[PDB]
Amino acid sequence: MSVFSGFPASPPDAILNLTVLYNADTNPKKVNLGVGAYRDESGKPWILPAVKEAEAIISSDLSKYNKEYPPVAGFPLFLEAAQFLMFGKDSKAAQEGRIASCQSLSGTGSLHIGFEFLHLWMPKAEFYMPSTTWPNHYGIYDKVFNKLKVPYKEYTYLRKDGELEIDFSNTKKDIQSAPEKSIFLFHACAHNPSGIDFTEAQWKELLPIMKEKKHIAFFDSAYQGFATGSFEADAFAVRMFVDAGVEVLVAQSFSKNFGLYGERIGCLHVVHAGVEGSVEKNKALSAAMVSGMTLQIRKTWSMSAIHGAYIVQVIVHDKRLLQMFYDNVKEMSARIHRMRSLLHASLAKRKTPGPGSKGTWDHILTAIGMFTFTGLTPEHVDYLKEKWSIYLVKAGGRMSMCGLTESNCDYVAEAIHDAVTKLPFK
Amino acid sequence: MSVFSGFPASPPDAILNLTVLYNADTNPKKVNLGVGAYRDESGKPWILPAVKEAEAIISSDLSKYNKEYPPVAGFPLFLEAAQFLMFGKDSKAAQEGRIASCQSLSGTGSLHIGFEFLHLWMPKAEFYMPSTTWPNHYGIYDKVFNKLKVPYKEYTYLRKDGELEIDFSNTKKDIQSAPEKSIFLFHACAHNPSGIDFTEAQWKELLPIMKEKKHIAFFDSAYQGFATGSFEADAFAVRMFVDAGVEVLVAQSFSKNFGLYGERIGCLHVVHAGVEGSVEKNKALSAAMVSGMTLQIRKTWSMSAIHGAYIVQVIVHDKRLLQMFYDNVKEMSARIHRMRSLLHASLAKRKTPGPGSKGTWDHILTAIGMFTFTGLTPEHVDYLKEKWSIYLVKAGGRMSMCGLTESNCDYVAEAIHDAVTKLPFK
Ligand SMILES: Cc1ncc(COP(=O)(O)O)c(C=O)c1O
Numbered sequence: 001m002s003v004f005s006g007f008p009a010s011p012p013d014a015i016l017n018l019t020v021l022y023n024a025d026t027n028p029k030k031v032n033l034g035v036g037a038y039r040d041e042s043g044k045p046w047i048l049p050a051v052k053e054a055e056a057i058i059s060s061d062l063s064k065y066n067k068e069y070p071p072v073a074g075f076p077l078f079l080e081a082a083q084f085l086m087f088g089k090d091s092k093a094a095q096e097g098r099i100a101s102c103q104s105l106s107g108t109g110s111l112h113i114g115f116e117f118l119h120l121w122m123p124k125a126e127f128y129m130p131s132t133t134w135p136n137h138y139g140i141y142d143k144v145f146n147k148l149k150v151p152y153k154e155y156t157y158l159r160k161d162g163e164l165e166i167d168f169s170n171t172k173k174d175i176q177s178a179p180e181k182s183i184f185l186f187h188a189c190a191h192n193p194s195g196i197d198f199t200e201a202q203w204k205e206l207l208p209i210m211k212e213k214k215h216i217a218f219f220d221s222a223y224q225g226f227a228t229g230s231f232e233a234d235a236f237a238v239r240m241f242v243d244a245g246v247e248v249l250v251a252q253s254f255s256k257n258f259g260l261y262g263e264r265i266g267c268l269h270v271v272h273a274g275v276e277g278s279v280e281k282n283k284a285l286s287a288a289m290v291s292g293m294t295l296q297i298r299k300t301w302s303m304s305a306i307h308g309a310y311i312v313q314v315i316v317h318d319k320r321l322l323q324m325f326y327d328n329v330k331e332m333s334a335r336i337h338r339m340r341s342l343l344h345a346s347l348a349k350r351k352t353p354g355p356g357s358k359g360t361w362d363h364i365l366t367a368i369g370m371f372t373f374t375g376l377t378p379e380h381v382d383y384l385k386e387k388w389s390i391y392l393v394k395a396g397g398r399m400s401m402c403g404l405t406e407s408n409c410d411y412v413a414e415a416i417h418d419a420v421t422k423l424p425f426k
Numbered sequence: 427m428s429v430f431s432g433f434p435a436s437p438p439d440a441i442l443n444l445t446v447l448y449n450a451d452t453n454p455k456k457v458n459l460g461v462g463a464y465r466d467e468s469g470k471p472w473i474l475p476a477v478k479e480a481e482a483i484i485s486s487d488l489s490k491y492n493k494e495y496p497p498v499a500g501f502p503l504f505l506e507a508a509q510f511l512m513f514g515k516d517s518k519a520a521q522e523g524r525i526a527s528c529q530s531l532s533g534t535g536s537l538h539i540g541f542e543f544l545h546l547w548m549p550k551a552e553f554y555m556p557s558t559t560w561p562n563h564y565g566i567y568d569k570v571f572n573k574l575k576v577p578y579k580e581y582t583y584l585r586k587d588g589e590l591e592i593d594f595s596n597t598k599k600d601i602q603s604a605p606e607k608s609i610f611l612f613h614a615c616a617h618n619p620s621g622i623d624f625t626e627a628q629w630k631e632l633l634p635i636m637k638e639k640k641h642i643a644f645f646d647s648a649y650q651g652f653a654t655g656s657f658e659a660d661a662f663a664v665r666m667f668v669d670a671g672v673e674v675l676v677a678q679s680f681s682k683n684f685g686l687y688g689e690r691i692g693c694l695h696v697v698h699a700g701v702e703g704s705v706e707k708n709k710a711l712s713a714a715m716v717s718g719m720t721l722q723i724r725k726t727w728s729m730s731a732i733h734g735a736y737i738v739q740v741i742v743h744d745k746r747l748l749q750m751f752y753d754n755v756k757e758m759s760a761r762i763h764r765m766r767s768l769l770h771a772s773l774a775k776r777k778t779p780g781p782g783s784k785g786t787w788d789h790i791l792t793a794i795g796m797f798t799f800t801g802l803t804p805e806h807v808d809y810l811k812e813k814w815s816i817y818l819v820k821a822g823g824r825m826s827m828c829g830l831t832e833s834n835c836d837y838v839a840e841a842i843h844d845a846v847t848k849l850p851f852k
């Protein structure tokens with residue numbers, strides 16, 4: 001006799017829930033390789049030194065860092081800081097009045113508002129995902145578009161034979177053969193889950209196709225800093241497209257690079273072609289678009305969260321803190337690279353069988369970003385969880401290298417050797 | 427030739443934009459009476475002493491108060507804090523497993539998720555708004571339901587003739603005449619914008635209608651602590667409805683009572699009737715409902731923001747800080763009352779003509795919450811802004827009493843006298 005009787009239990013999120021099951025596990029040798037969240041040498045969360053300093057500043061002056069509603073698009077200093085990190089200082093696009101920027105709720109919140117923005121303005125534009133992508137891209141898409149009314153489309157990313165390589169000849173054909181003015185979701189770098197990226201050369205081949213077809217590039221940029229360790233370099237494809245006049249959106253998260261996961265801080269940008277006929281007309285169009293983004297947000301969560309905005313704007317606008325921040329990101333990247341070499345060496349030492357035709361583990365060494373798409377099967381993943389207390393993502397056997405430490409790499413290598421010995425690859 | 431060419435400008439929010447305009451205004455006698463945001467004796471943002479203490483606690487240990495992704499429903503201590511404040515300590519509803527709680531992005535984000543929760547679960551249920559309500563409710567509603575495909579209905583709230591009294595006879599007819607199992611949006615206390623509330627006696631009359639018709643009550647509760655100045659009393663309607671077995675949702679904001687406006691911290695509750703057959707089955711239903719809310723959120727902004735959650739939980743679970751918090755909220759209510767008296771005295775001393783049949787300003791004294799629904803006309807509001815740099819909400823001449831001070835009340839009264847003498851009431 002309840003109106004809620006029979007309400008269905010939704011399974012927990014296949015990635016986020018791993019941390020929950022992990023925290024609950026009482027095995028002292030447990031290892032968390034699930035969610036892409038940085039961990040230090042001891043396997044623990046890490047506050048970036050630049051963020052620790054920012055906290056000291058903003059927690060010391062609550063008159064200045066007060067708790068009132070922010071401007072609807074975000075604090076100007078935060079928006080300038082965001083543009084600076086993504087597009088560079090005083091970029092061409094900014095000078096020309098082409099960037100429409102609006103604070104949102106980290107990457108996911110920027111995707112949600114960015115997807116809706118496009119679905120409202122261009123309801124007949126086809127929306128293309130790479131054939132492998134972050135699973136939550138599907139959910140965010142569904143709530144905005146409704147997969148049943150407006151199915152997403154796909155472009156070729158990894159080879160259909162399984163091997164960890166972009167089938168780029170087919171990528172190009174798919175983007176070329178798509179209808180003009182379609183939207184293409186791209187990871188800016190450190191493609192998640194595959195760890196395989198377009199090279200510079202390949203992005204350059206995409207460029208003229210995007211131009212001829214007048215396609216919109218939608219970049220998801222959550223790992224700026226984690227591909228090459230260099231901010232500038234990791235924005236290559238975004239800045240190249242913009243400079244060439246490709247029209248773009250960017251969903252920019254600061255969860256991973258600033259380690260501000262729970263603060264829920266990021267920025268959505270739209271960069272138009274700059275062809276309105278004057279700088280002032282470009283700015284008017286940019287402002288119009290920010291006004292549309294803020295109206296959307298107004299009806300969803302009113303306006304965005306200040307604490308993470310304060311942290312980012314304080315760091316980027318202080319010359320000392322900004323350099324510390326760059327160095328902190330370089331340090332995380334370097335530890336991840338260390339764990340790649342160490343896990344690999346421990347697997348090689350054991351002559352552990354691997355996936356694919358080659359049957360090797362060299363892909364651990366060459367993956368870009370936080371993860372390796374290991375190739376371990378669903379059976380391997382369950383076994384590693386149940387017998388060894390090692391938590392991987394089931395799909396693709398995605399491994400977060402940040403959970404590895406000098407103390408546990410050989411333990412992880414041993415568990416894998418056991419898993420693959422007891423259930424060989426087909 | 428841009429794909430964004432012709433994108434329309436959306437006008438600024440009519441309430442939030444008042445702070446933007448007020449901030450740009452160079453007139454040193456400017457008065458902000460727009461957004462309902464507490465201000466102290468000097469007209470400045472006020473960090474609650476309880477919040478100041480909480481900040482020092484959480485800013486001092488960033489390992490304990492880390493920046494990792496929170497649990498998808500929110501920290502258990504926060505959820506417990508939120509339930510305690512709304513329903514009481516170890517409520518009968520909690521003991522029976524009837525409460526499903528999920529952190530959300532303050533009031534607005536709680537309404538969004540709660541509106542969508544019901545529209546997904548009970549798509550055929552009619553949704554009823556009071557005939558006067560918070561403007562953003564219409565927009566929150568439009569994004570979930572689509573105003574044009576699925577219009578909201580209304581129940582009678584204020585009298586046809588414009589006078590500040592609820593036409594309670596028609597309120598009951600309207601709720602009695604609606605199809606059974608309809609959804610009614612209610613303000614828990616301090617109805618915004620009118621400042622006129624159902625009395626305890628009126629709420630008790632609505633109870634049997636709600637039971638008989640098996641309606642769902644959706645409570646918007648942002649002002650607990652600002653109506654009667656007592657948390658317990660301000661949750662009367664919610665607690666009475668739940669104790670009687672009315673199934674409710676509550677969208678609970680900590681923007682105003684904790685002064686955490688910009689942190690974006692609130693909680694969504696669904697309280698089912700607890701007829702699943704056991705406490706465990708009640709809890710299983712509640713958890714399933716939480717699982718749906720968190721799936722919604724996953725697709726929208728992933729999970730909610732930690733900083734405000736930390737402040738609230740730290741306050742509520744420390745006996746000294748909770749008492750300090752309660753004292754702090756009383757101090758805010760007390761200042762508002764003193765400003766009601768001072769502004770009313772300053773109008774009365776000038777024999778300033780008032781709106782309505784009575785033509786008096788007494789409704790300044792009796793309004794509940796932060797506002798007075800003044801009845802100044804849109805011509806008056808525009809005149810007060812242009813000639814006196816006083817910022818009010820155009821709709822109903824809603825005035826935020828929180829912007830008044832000992833220094834500026836007489837100025838506001840002189841200005842109102844001028845506006846009303848030049849532009850007499852029809
Ligand atoms: C590729 C990608 N996009 C978006 C996100 C969104 O994460 P968040 O909402 O914390 O920014 C993530 C990380 O989870 C990601 O890896």
Ligand SMILES: Cc1ncc(COP(=O)(O)O)c(C=O)c1O
Pocket residue numbers: 301302462531532533534535560618646647648679680681687692
């Ligand atoms: C009547 C009413 N409902 C809901 C809200 C929610 O505001 P917020 O999103 O800051 O919690 C408020 C605040 O403006 C309010 O006054």
